[PDB]
Design a protein around this ligand. Structure first.
Ligand SMILES: CCCCCCCCNC(=S)N1[C@@H]2OC[C@H]1[C@@H](O)[C@H](O)[C@H]2O
Ligand SMILES: [Ca+2]
Length: 438
């Protein structure tokens, strides 16, 4: 048996644009994912978030699912342009009303809300003004965050400023694969820096507004292993792609060494002037983790991936459970944050509904079990892991892959919007009830 600490938080996670649909309902402004997905060529099969899981209408049902599974926490994100349709200035009460009902329902049902303030759906109005490239977003983001805190801080006590700011910056502004779909390395590194400044301003405002809650920030992480003896390229990928790109500034007041070696020229000339403010104290670190990568030096960023003959998900991501134990050990050893959460872990598989009406995703069960086992290990060795969140409650719009990738522990038939709890969801409910494995 692998039992977790008393009060360990077992949750599931979603993001607004991925599940809600109705992007322009009730006075909402367009987001950059609306405009990006409505641009031909950007998303597989021309898929958009227009309907998604119709959570905008089916939210009560979905929460009743969380309740019925006995899941203890729900991580969800708020659509900035539902709240402030122009990004700043006007506040939309119908947008606040939508999330107020969700929050009150969760609380009524004894489920702990964890709110992600930003999971990628920037108001389009702000993108016209340069979005994450513009220093002024530290102010726009603080004003947005202040509204959320003033309206919801009486009830929501667990907050996340940013989801995966590496993805936002690099995949959105260097690779151009995500909104706003740009390819400029100087813009990408100014977005990294402004994400940090905006994150810190929001925490500063939080201390002024919600004297009783906690706030943190969520990073994507891979487990990079070297293709031989010879490991520095592993060092670069860790410092660039993982929590250190952001935590080195927050805890130590500068970017990591190998990031500055690669990217100094792309950062603002006087970027250190902002570092003292970037060090605003945070309460926890959220780590997302899915995949391991075999890496070797290669004379683009002087790194290339080397395919491995390992079990993979429908994303083509290699399944390396020890990765989640490594990243938890590593974060304690490098920055020693006071709390850590695993804010996303999960897998995409080609799920099918059997003739028996059930989804027999033993592949997803095996994936979740192994990773929860490794998380358990990290705890035994002193990592202050307070919770673990499955990505995702529901199959949903998987960004540039559209609906072709299913991460839910609940199956969604998009022709009907029927939800079918998968075997993995049933399995997870039992883990939560037992507070651990076997
Ligand atoms: C190239 C395809 C672009 C979008 C397809 C997926 C690639 C990026 N996916 C990433 S980085 N994801 C993280 O966890 C699962 C998946 C996404 O569903 C979630 O919002 C993120 O927090
Ligand atoms: Ca549309």
């Amino acid at each position: 048996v692998k039992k977790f600490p008393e009060g360990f938080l077992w949750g599931v996670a979603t993001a607004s644009y991925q599940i809600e649909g109705s992007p322009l309902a009730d006075g909402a402004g367009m987001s950059i994912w609306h405009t990006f997905s409505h641009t031909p060529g950007n998303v597989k099969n021309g898929d958009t978030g227009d309907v998604a899981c119709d959570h905008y209408n089916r939210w009560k049902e979905d929460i009743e699912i969380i309740e019925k599974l006995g899941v203890k926490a729900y991580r969800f994100s708020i659509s900035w342009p539902r709240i402030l349709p122009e990004g700043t200035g006007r506040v939309n009460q119908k947008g606040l009303d939508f999330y107020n009902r969700i929050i009150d329902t969760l609380l009524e049902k004894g489920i702990t809300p964890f709110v992600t303030i930003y999971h990628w759906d920037l108001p389009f109005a702000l993108q016209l003004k340069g979005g994450w490239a513009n220093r002024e977003i530290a102010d726009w983001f603080a004003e947005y965050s202040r509204v959320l805190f003033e309206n919801f801080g009486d009830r929501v006590k667990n907050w996340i400023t940013l989801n995966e700011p590496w993805v936002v910056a690099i995949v959105g502004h260097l690779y151009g694969v995500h909104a706003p779909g740009m390819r400029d390395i100087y813009v990408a590194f100014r977005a990294v820096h402004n994400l940090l400044r905006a994150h810190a301003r929001a925490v500063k405002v939080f201390r002024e507004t919600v004297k009783d809650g906690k706030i943190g920030i969520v990073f994507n992480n891979g487990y990079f292993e070297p293709a031989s003896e010879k490991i520095r390229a592993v060092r670069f990928m860790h410092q660039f792609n993982n929590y250190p790109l952001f935590l080195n500034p927050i805890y130590r007041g500068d970017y990591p060494e190998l990031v500055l070696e690669f990217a100094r020229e792309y950062l603002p000339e006087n970027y250190k002037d902002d570092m003292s403010e970037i060090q605003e104290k945070i309460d926890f670190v959220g780590l997302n983790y899915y995949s391991g990568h075999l890496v070797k030096f290669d004379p683009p960023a002087k790194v290339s991936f080397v395919e491995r003959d390992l079990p993979k998900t429908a994303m083509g991501w290699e399944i390396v459970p020890e990765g989640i134990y490594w990243i938890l050990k590593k974060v304690k050893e490098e920055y020693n944050p006071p709390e850590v959460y695993i804010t996303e872990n999960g897998a995409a598989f080609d799920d099918v509904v059997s003739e028996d009406g059930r989804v027999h995703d033993q592949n997803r069960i095996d994936y979740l079990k192994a990773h929860i086992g490794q998380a358990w290990k990290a705890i035994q060795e002193g990592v202050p892991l307070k919770g673990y969140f499955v990505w995702s409650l529901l199959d949903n719009f998987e960004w540039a892959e559209g609906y072709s990738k299913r991460f839910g522990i609940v199956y969604v038939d998009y022709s009907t919007q029927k939800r079918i709890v998968k075997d993995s969801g049933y399995w997870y409910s039992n883990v939560v009830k037992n507070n651990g494995l076997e």
